[PDB]
Every structure is written in C-alpha cells, then in structure tokens.
Amino acid sequence: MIQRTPKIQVYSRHPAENGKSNFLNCYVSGFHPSDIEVDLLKNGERIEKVCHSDLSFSKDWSFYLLYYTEFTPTEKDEYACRVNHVTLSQPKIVKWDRD
Amino acid sequence: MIQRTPKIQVYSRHPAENGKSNFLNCYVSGFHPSDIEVDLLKNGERIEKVCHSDLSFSKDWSFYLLYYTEFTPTEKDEYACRVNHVTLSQPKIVKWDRD
Amino acid sequence: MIQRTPKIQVYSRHPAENGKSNFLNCYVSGFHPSDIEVDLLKNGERIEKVCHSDLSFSKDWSFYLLYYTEFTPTEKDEYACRVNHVTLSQPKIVKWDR
Amino acid sequence: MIQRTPKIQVYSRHPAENGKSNFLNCYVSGFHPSDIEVDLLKNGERIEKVCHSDLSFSKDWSFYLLYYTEFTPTEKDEYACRVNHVTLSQPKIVKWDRD
C-alpha cells in the first residue's frame, strides 16, 4: 500500500492542425492511493463537461486514469492539465505542446 | 451475426431536481451490428459535448453502449435521445420522462 | 475522507441451469477507501482465475467494482464471495442462491 | 462500411523473468468489422482463463481490443495468440518473442 507519485502526459488524439475538431487528453498513470484531483484548462480557465474513463488497477494497486474533452485547436488558445495528489507538495500544471 | 434491433432507455443518474447538477444517460442495448448513430437532444437540438463508454459485447456479438452528458435540469428545457441503426426503418426518438 | 462499508451482491449473468456455461458475478458497491480484497469461492476454496472490471467512482469518492468468472454450475458445487475491507473486523462471506 | 485487416501485437506487461508472475497480452488493432475470434495459446493449447477489455472505436468505425491473462513464465513453455477475422483467408498465429 506504499504511495506512488503520478506520471502526467498531455496530448492530442490526432496530429494538431487548426480550425477542425479533435480531442485533448490528460493521462495520469502509476499512482497510489486512488483519490486524485484532475482538471483541464483553456487560457487558465477550467473546461466545462470533461469526460473521464474508469480507474484501472494493477496487482500491487497502481492506478491509471484518463481525462478527455472534444476541442477545436487555434493559434490564440493555450491548453493545460492541473493535477493534485497526496504525494505532491503543490498541484502540478502540465502544459500542452501543440507539437 | 443475425440482425438485432436496439433497446433504448433514457434516464437520469440521480432523482431529478431543478437547479441541481445531474447526468443524462441514453442506454442502447442488445443490438447487432456494431455501427450505431446515437445523439442526445436539448429542445430538438444536438448536444455538443457528449461522453460515451466503450462497446461491450456477448458471445453471440450482441452490443451494449452508453451515451451520457452533464446537465442542470430546468422547467423550460426538454430532453430526448435520437438513435439510428441499420435494423430501423427511420431514426427513433425516445423522450426523457421526469414523472 | 470518511469510511463507507461495502454492499455485496452475488448473482449469475443468465438464469442458472446445470451442465450449461454461465458467469458468476460479485458486485461490490458504495465503499471508501479503494483497497478491497474480493475473492470468489467454490466449496470454500478460492478460484484462481478471476476477471475484474475497472474501479468506477462518484464525486465524494464512493467506489463500485465487479469481480466475475466463467463457470459451469452443478448440483454438488456451492458458490460464494468473500470480501475483506478496512471497515470490517472479519471478512464477510455472501453465498450464491440458485 | 470498408474492410480493414487487424494488427496483432503479442507482449508481456513487465520484462519477462523465470519464476516471477506476469501478464500475457494480445493487442488487436485498426480492424473492421467488429466480429473477431481471439485466443491465447500455451504450447499449442487454448488457455481457458482469458480476460478481455471492451471494444473501443473511432469515427470511421476502426476497432481496438485487448485480450489478457495472468501467467508465470518458464524456459520450457511457449506462448502465442491466434486471431481469425473475415479479412483473413485462414487464422493467424503470432508467437510471443520473449527477447
């Protein structure tokens, strides 16, 4: 039941190109315990109606969770993911690199 | 691999209350083949950000799928679910009954 | 984070009939914390090959989990589900009824 | 509806080591239609204890499915995955390369 720090990965479903519709993902992996605060950001503002998968687990109880939303990438808009867990001293913000 | 018509069920996660946040679900079950068009409606208009589960299956390939969205019910707003499948002669609209 | 005792439900996927293949389910619901020990039993003995769904959660962190296995029911064999959690002093055994 | 041949990947969850518990995975991806026969083998014999994920899909209906089982690797035992689909003339056997 020994605690593990989460691994945060912010990416888009398909290679980024403006004007069209796509998906913004925030993959949180290999953490313990279960209770985790995950939020998706658009220009510093929290995104409304974010979808999330069910909490997947391994034999030694390491958790895997995915937070995703439908979005239109533009030249103006900046996207990020905010994660808060018991292992972290402060909430972590991981920015999305349109690359 | 034999034609099965889908069973549509429209319901809310918790007992509905005006002004209180809830979830609107559209459960589609026991259908074949896999390809199905499911849409959640608000006053006749298609809801933008709709979340969906993964397609679960049985031994004889009968499919089960859930379409859900976060919503705040009001007295004015009417909700429904539109389903289109290869078995159906025309798309079926199932209204949400909160009574 | 305030504790919640689990609700255990033991059932078969389809109506049971001897000699024919089925699935034995153990649905554990509305519990906190996450760490739960769920085991499916055959004549008091632990079943080695058991599948499980993914841990679903609510706003206040109440958990929902399903443990299932493929089985061929007989009139000799008895089935049950053993659950151990931090909220309980001794593990709870819930028997399956045909 | 267009036809797509499945991509089969056979791998272990953690790097394989004799006597230590592991998981054998058979990842089937980018196929159409849905109906697919997947089986995990041990020395040519079909494994009875097999768990499987839910069928995930894209906009153009391309399917993704994972078949997994708990196993203890030895130097003597050989593992493989057998897949049979409508696109294939005969079932395909993909062996698990340990190294």
From Swiss-Prot, chain C:
Annotated GO biological process: amyloid fibril formation; antigen processing and presentation of endogenous peptide antigen via MHC class I; antigen processing and presentation of exogenous peptide antigen via MHC class II; antigen processing and presentation of exogenous protein antigen via MHC class Ib, TAP-dependent; cellular response to iron ion; cellular response to iron(III) ion; cellular response to nicotine; intracellular iron ion homeostasis
Statement: the UniProt record of this protein carries the keyword Ribonucleoprotein: no
Residue list for modification Pyrrolidone carboxylic acid: Q3
A GO cellular-component term linked to this record: HFE-transferrin receptor complex
Keywords noted in UniProt: Amyloid, Amyloidosis, Disease variant, Disulfide bond, Glycation, Glycoprotein, Immunity, Immunoglobulin domain, MHC I, Pyrrolidone carboxylic acid, Secreted, Signal
Subunit structure comment from the entry: Heterodimer of an alpha chain and a beta chain. Beta-2-microglobulin is the beta-chain of major histocompatibility complex class I molecules. Polymers of beta 2-microglobulin can be found in tissues from patients on long-term hemodialysis. B2M alone (not in complex with HLA-I) interacts with M.tuberculosis EsxA (ESAT-6) and an EsxA-EsxB (CFP-10) complex; the tripartite complex can be detected in the host endoplasmic reticulum. The B2M-EsxA complex can be detected in patients with pleural tuberculosis and is stable from pH 4.0 to 8.0 and in the presence of 2M NaCl.
Function: Component of the class I major histocompatibility complex (MHC). Involved in the presentation of peptide antigens to the immune system. Exogenously applied M.tuberculosis EsxA or EsxA-EsxB (or EsxA expressed in host) binds B2M and decreases its export to the cell surface (total protein levels do not change), probably leading to defects in class I antigen presentation.
Family from the record: Belongs to the beta-2-microglobulin family.
Protein known as: Beta-2-microglobulin
Native source organism of the sequence: Homo sapiens
Whole sequence portion shown: 21 to 117 of 119
